[PDB]
Design a protein around this ligand. Structure first.
Ligand SMILES: *[C@@H]1O[C@H](CO)[C@@H](O[C@@H]2O[C@H](CO)[C@@H](O[C@@H]3O[C@H](CO)[C@@H](O)[C@H](O)[C@@H]3O)[C@H](O)[C@H]2NC(C)=O)[C@H](O)[C@H]1NC(C)=O
Ligand SMILES: *[C@@H]1O[C@H](CO)[C@@H](O[C@@H]2O[C@H](CO)[C@@H](O)[C@H](O)[C@H]2NC(C)=O)[C@H](O)[C@H]1NC(C)=O
Ligand code: NAG
Lengths: 448, 113, 123, 140, 123, 448, 122, 448
């Protein structure tokens, strides 16, 4: 004698994919700073968090199949483009350039690194001449024959970045629609997959900074109580390893040259910002890292790889295997200037079981972001000297070699994907759909 | 292109013989490949000058085909075949490559006896 | 005490908080996101409301039905269910048998609608 | 065919002289205008020219201080103006009409192929019509 | 069986399967016109429920009311309808008076929702 | 007898709504985008669920049908959307210098192709290149040996993206919730009136957006008899539609082996010229079989006299003329546009075998598609020889009409507006709007 | 008419509830339509959902098992239903609304389990 | 004793902000002339809007903080931008001009107002150029250092106003969405703020003409009983005064020249409409106002301004203080021409305890409209003579000065802000949202 009773509002959820919506704080919203990740879209965020802890609850996570990371990738790309739409398009810059080396005050380290180029142009009127010049970096010009052209001419014409917009990452919060929930894993020992005994639910995620980097994760969130190593198929060789630090390593970067701007007029109401001329002497850009606090950190990373790779295996670190400058170098931008720096000084050692390091960097102004083809961007020059300081919170590593069962392991820096930079933040979160109807047996009957 | 020089200052030719006068150019004088801008004029005594050859090989209308010119890129010469009494005069080579345009110094021709 | 908080507690203790979950089921080309999302929310809520409405449970959070509980579905004693089990466990045991049950609930309803109308007509 | 010039001139120093050179009716309007100077033993020398389009006009910097050329389009009259004459300015002045080649040695084009601006350069092909002379004599 | 499958069955037999129809009423070229359709379907669906909600039938597929039938609308007997007709053509016959009948059903409802509460306020 | 209220009654009435597309999921495996936007179109159902309706005698009408009008706008809108990311050939409007091609030519093709050379732009703004391309006679006009492209005095054309395909794919039309699509199943339905065999479907059958003129290709066949359909059968200003009960194959080919050539006219965008022709140059044509075509006309006449009398003489003629877009059989064969002289088919008089009929066809590269003036498309050439085989399943006819005479009826091919094509497929279907509320007397009364 | 009794007394308006209830629902100008429509439907459903958990769910007038706290208001019924107005009533009791709304939720659940316990003893 | 009772449908409301939508007069639907701020694509208004009176209900109004004016301002600008997206862009027109005076037959006052300019423009063939001429008003050109340019060439490129779109102000009705209501203040002596002892409810607002003007409100709605003076804070100089007349005074305007429009083709499918020549004598454009009627209307305004500043204070009127043409002159457009008239002859008087006023006017063709910089429009000429008659129904004034006492007040015209114009129409409306849930005490107790 048992009859079906139907309940509405039961706490049951199921894995699902849905379109999250962005939220942001009001500091930039109140004054219209116009960041690339503009607040015009994201709604004002809640005045305070409303997280709820769930006792007795166990849930199965997987950081590597998360739909959140894919939905963040597309939106970051889309928000980037819509910011570049109104800006002037530098189609008239594809002419023949006549360039000569700058010889005034040059450090031997960068003989012939930037050039003094001149070319014909029109003024604000269609039918009047104008001859202009500008300094260009050697990576942006390719010889055609002492005649050159910009690297991008034979593929596409790309848009100058509007001077009043900024690339600085402001945190953006990802909040779930009605009928859905976000489960956050609070386990300190989590390895990115398997059950999480300390689940809790939150209205929506913490502030995430959309930083762009390679071979090193900058301005991120630190692990707790121990360095963490996350990989899905650790015994592979085509699977990257994500390392998260428990204490930052500080990196300082600078571009000592004192550059000067020059606003050229090309067409009605359009301007081109040339590099003018440099005050002082030309020197190499570089970044600094502490020799003591960096090899005190590699000693903590190795002691975790010793777990996955034997108690007496001899580890080894080496520089990038090769490829394009965007993948073999620690790329980033600070102060609106794009850096491509040589990390061969850091990944060089063997572990057998002040003297701050300097990394020389090269600058560029023709930018191909998101690994797309046929679409670049031109970075206007920045007045004065620029400097920046940032945390280092993680590495992207790629193993190689299978010649022996276990004698040594050689690790090199990665950079073959961009979602890796955001799987380091969205690893605690997952989205679930709520199914509130349930039927259970109990002794009851419909009277009458 | 500034200065042009002609090698023979005076020339004597027996009737029935051929004649040759060469004009030397300081600079290229060639625009590109097919075009050479040199011309040859004659100023018979007590008369106005006259056009004989232009573009360094082309012959003017009304000029008997005994006048033939050849040369390119800083070497030119005007040939007359079986010269006649009326060939006495003075010949100037003119260059049209770059302003100001200049004349040669002049080669003087006389019937031999 | 808050939204979804009783997900790990006994089944009987979880049913005391149905209202907390019940309240939260509802609330330029780039921004069509914030419109696609809301329309979806409305039509999902209306699907559950209709599904209850054609069972006889128009506005009831805990609605009784006359459908006998086939023992082949689950064999537990009521103490084994309402005291020492969680709703996220019960979902695992009945998932296969769920789709058919909504049929029996729907079959039993219109029978009453036809029956009661006849009994009123008998007046 | 031929051109006809004004008769000989004899002017004392310091004064000015106008020389005329006219074509039969309107038989030569598509040919450019040139002026040449002859001094016995000094050879032929080139003074200046006017393009038939009217877009160009130059004079050698040797003579540019005093000489000036005019072309009365309506009457088809060509004038050579000499001022501040000296004993070395005695010569015989010819007028010539000839052809030219105009070649676009450089051009900057728009996105859709339209021309913004270009530099056309004039090269001299030949001097094919000539005048008779004007024996300007400078004496006390 | 089947959606609208009873359109040709008799008025009396087609009324036994009302659930199949009601359950089917709410189930960038082609990206912006799609949404303009989905919202309309929900808009129409709530129009019906609102009407049923102000006649007291807010949760039933069959509902009877205290509004007397007027022969001036249709004087025919059940010996002439309900077993020898189809719903498709009854709509044609009775359409001329629908605007009226929907109105009586309203006043006839507040006529009940007050007299009911007047008893609880007295006893 | 008290008023009852019923919800969910099966009642409906006619009304217009926005149908949405549905396409086979199996087509996604092709991976190649097409004009008809399979990705935008909704995925279709695994299989249809058609339901028969007994006793039902709905009234249909094919001429005042809102479904066809919607399909017209959808097709045009999809067409325009596909040409946005392609190249705008603005720099192609320049003076051309052309000479006749007389190298290994036949008599009939003499003067139909021209050899044009012109200056053109390149990737650098201060340089130009001299190139040549073969152009058909119909595309160029003279400027009184100097020519220009015909469209230059009207507007600038958009080059068709070389990757997309013009190949039709079936699209299903579906009704939104609360609406239904009724389908007629009478085998002798003349387009209007009762349909004693109605049924309802979730979506229509797969319909191919084929574009044609004077002959319907790749369509649906009738059953057991040739069906004639018209609105006002004694009106000379009305078109007549004929649907065959069996198809007659038409083979079309372009024998020339011509080669595509690429020219760079700007940064990142190229123009596709015709390079040369290998071997002899011949004329394109289409073939029909005399034995099979003739018997089809004999079936077509039989049903025509049933309207115009048994004793009436009937004739077929070759149309009263017009522009090539309307006076010829125009269609698309593998990415190349044809225009065929159909005079060989419609030439007969009726009074009551391995052979062929050859139709000489011309080709055109500047296309105005939907009878608009202002939007033109440039179809790039196609490498090698091409061939097409297709059903003929219909025929569009117009009547000249006799004045004071009745013993001879002469018909000609027409073509009308493009939406006459899809009336041949959507004649069966109509959209209805459900009305779930009803009131009826019963014995019931409410208690208390 | 619609809102045609906004100046009448509370008792007088109580028989005009239906006129309001019927009116609660149903390219620059184009994008305006979609925003407005989806705002109206969502507002309508919140009232219906909220009015449903309280146990009424189909009714415009509905009694409840929650007594009236004197602190919310003390004035007499001869001083409310015949001399106040709804626009004036919302001014008297504004702060308490969200506190009262939290009571009817519990009162109904007690009924739901009680009229379910009072069915299991059979 | 008393149990709570919940009522659904109680009449109550609260101030709110929402998106209103346009409704159009159905009688203008058939025109299909495609004017700016399309009255098509609006929801057609019903023939009899329903006004509902609310007896003895008092409501607070505030016209200055009203949000409706902000929406209308944002809508009108949005409509204006779309209306000239498709058609021609005058980038080729930014060349050097060679101009000379025009003096064929000119009045002494128009001595040097317009000039005859010649420029070398492109042809539909990209490789050819043509010499053309046009007449430009002196305000539209500037010397480069007789070489001129259009004023905008150093600021932006203008879009040609689109020849077949009309600028007429068709009335627009604003409707509220379901669940919101609009209230109208029926009081006649309402000064814009505070209680309104007579209110009513409407479905949608009356027709509002989007008339754009400065220093005078044209074709507006009149007052009912008396001339009304309105302001936020009369004791502040820096805040404008709005006046509403009880009667109209006619203003007649005309450009008395016989213009000729000449088409110039600058590209495939694109044409530039230049002004060719004047058929007859050249005269100044002007507007007329009745001297006897302006002399009395200002009599009332002073009579109504004595209620604020005293029975005895001397009140003076002075012409515009100073500024650019857009603000310092009375601007408007009739037909298609944009007038900038000199109102120094209207505001000239001093008040202590058949003739016509002829205001000279100037014309412009390069228009900035909404006080934006970098966005521009070009208005093509109109053939023939143009004349217009209009109401005047309000003034926008600003008082100034005042030192140690109010001894002589002075007023001047102003009001370059375009949203003060519509605030004179939407001063009687406000939008509220309905809250149909109410809880009240009653004896009634639920059954169980
Ligand atoms: C099918 O098409 C025919 C035309 O081929 C239509 O018949 C025409 O109908 C019009 C309108 O009724 C007739 O005009 C009237 O005719 C008589 C002349 O005595 C007179 O009553 C009026 O003054 C008027 O002109 C027209 O004569 C007639 N034509 C023929 C040839 O009969 C017919 O209406 C169409 N059918 C349908 C259903 O639309
Ligand atoms: C983890 O990575 C290893 C590779 O190092 C995978 O092992 C291989 O799996 C494939 C597929 O079954 C076999 O064909 C190979 O023989 C395996 N190689 C070895 C050395 O065992 C392993 O499958 C991966 N694990 C998962 C869960 O994907
Ligand atoms: C992560 O933890 C899970 C659960 O214990 C385990 O199965 C897995 O092997 C661990 N490591 C990796 C690399 O997945």
């Amino acid at each position: 004698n048992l009859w079906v009773t139907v309940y509405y509002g039961v706490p049951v959820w199921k894995d699902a994919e849905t379109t999250l919506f962005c939220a942001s704080d009001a500091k930039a919203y109140e004054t219209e700073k116009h960041n690339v990740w503009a607040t015009h879209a994201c709604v004002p965020t809640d005045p305070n968090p409303q997280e709820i802890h769930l006792e007795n609850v166990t849930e199965e996570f997987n950081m590597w199949k998360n739909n959140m990371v894919e939905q963040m990738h597309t939106d970051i790309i889309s928000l980037w483009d819509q910011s570049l739409k109104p800006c002037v398009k530098l189609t008239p810059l594809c002419v023949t350039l006549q360039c000569t080396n700058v010889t005034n005050n040059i450090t031997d380290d960068m003989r012939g690194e930037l050039k003094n180029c001149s070319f014909n142009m029109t003024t604000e009127l269609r039918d009047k001449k104008q001859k202009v010049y500008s300094l260009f970096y050697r990576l942006d010009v390719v010889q055609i024959n002492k005649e050159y052209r910009l690297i991008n001419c034979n593929t596409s014409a790309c848009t100058q970045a509007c001077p009043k917009v900024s690339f600085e990452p402001i945190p953006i919060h990802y909040c779930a629609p009605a009928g859905f929930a976000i489960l956050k894993c609070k386990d300190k020992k989590f390895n990115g997959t398997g059950p999480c005994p300390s689940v809790s639910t939150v209205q929506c995620t913490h502030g995430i900074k959309p930083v762009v980097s390679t071979q090193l994760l900058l301005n991120g969130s630190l692990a707790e109580e121990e360095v963490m190593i996350r990989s899905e198929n650790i015994t592979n060789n085509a699977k990257n390893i994500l390392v998260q630090f428990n204490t930052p390593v500080q990196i300082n970067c600078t571009r000592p040259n004192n550059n000067t701007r020059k606003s050229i007029r090309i067409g009605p109401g359009q301007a081109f910002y040339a590099t003018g001329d440099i005050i002082g002497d030309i020197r190499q850009a570089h970044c600094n890292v502490s020799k003591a606090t960096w090899n005190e950190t590699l000693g903590k990373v190795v002691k975790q790889l010793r777990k996955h790779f034997g108690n007496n295996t001899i580890i080894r670190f080496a520089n990038s295997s090769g490829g394009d400058l965007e993948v073999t170098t620690h790329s980033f931008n600070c102060g609106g200037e794009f850096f491509y720096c040589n990390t061969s000084g850091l990944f060089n050692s063997t572990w057998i079981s002040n003297d701050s390091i300097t990394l020389p960097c090269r600058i560029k102004q023709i930018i191909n972001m998101w690994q797309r083809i046929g679409q670049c961007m031109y970075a206007p020059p920045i007045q004065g000297v620029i400097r920046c300081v940032s945390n280092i919170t993680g590495l992207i590593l790629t193993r190689d070699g299978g010649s022996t069962n276990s004698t040594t392991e050689t690790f090199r820096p990665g950079g073959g994907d961009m979602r890796d930079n955001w799987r380091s933040e969205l690893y605690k979160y997952k989205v679930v759909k709520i199914e509130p109807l349930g039927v259970a047996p109990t002794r009851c009957k419909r009277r009458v | 292109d500034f200065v042009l020089t002609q090698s023979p200052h005076s020339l004597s030719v027996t009737p029935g013989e051929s004649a040759s006068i060469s004009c030397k150019s300081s600079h290229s004088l060639i625009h590109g490949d097919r075009n050479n801008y040199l011309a040859w004029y004659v100023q018979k005594p007590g008369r106005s000058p006259q056009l004989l050859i232009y573009l360094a090989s082309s012959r003017a209308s009304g000029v008997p085909d005994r006048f033939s010119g050849s040369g390119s890129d800083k070497d030119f010469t005007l040939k007359i075949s079986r010269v006649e009494t009326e060939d006495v005069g003075t010949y100037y080579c003119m260059q049209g490559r770059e302003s100001p345009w200049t004349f040669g110094q002049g080669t003087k021709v006389d019937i031999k006896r | 005490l808050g939204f979804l908080g009783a997900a790990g507690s006994t089944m009987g203790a979880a049913s005391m908080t149905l209202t907390v979950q019940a309240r939260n089921l509802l609330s330029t080309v780039w921004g069509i996101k914030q419109l696609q999302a809301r329309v979806l929310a409305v039509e999902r809520y209306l699907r559950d409301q209709q599904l209850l409405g054609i069972w006889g449970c128009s506005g009831k959070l805990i609605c009784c039905t006359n459908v006998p509980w086939n023992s082949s579905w689950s064999n537990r004693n009521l103490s084994e269910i309402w005291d020492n089990m969680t709703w996220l466990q019960w979902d695992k045991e009945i998932s296969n048998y769920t789709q058919i049950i909504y049929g029996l609930l729907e079959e039993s309803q219109n029978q009453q609608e036809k029956n009661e109308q006849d009994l009123l007509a008998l007046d | 065919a031929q051109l006809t010039q004004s008769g000989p001139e004899v002017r004392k120093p310091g004064t000015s002289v106008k020389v005329s050179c006219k074509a039969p009716g309107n038989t030569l309007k598509t040919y450019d205008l040139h002026w040449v100077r002859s001094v016995p033993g000094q050879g032929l020398q080139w003074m200046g020219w006017i393009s038939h389009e009217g877009d160009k006009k130059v004079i050698v910097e040797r003579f540019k201080a005093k000489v000036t050329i005019d072309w009365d389009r309506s009457t088809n009259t060509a004038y050579l103006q000499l001022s501040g004459l000296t004993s070395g300015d005695t010569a015989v002045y010819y007028c010539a009409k000839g052809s030219k080649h105009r070649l676009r040695d450089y051009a900057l084009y728009d996105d859709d192929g339209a021309l913004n601006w270009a530099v056309d350069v004039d090269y001299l092909s030949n001097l094919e019509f000539w005048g008779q002379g004007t024996a300007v004599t400078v004496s006390s």
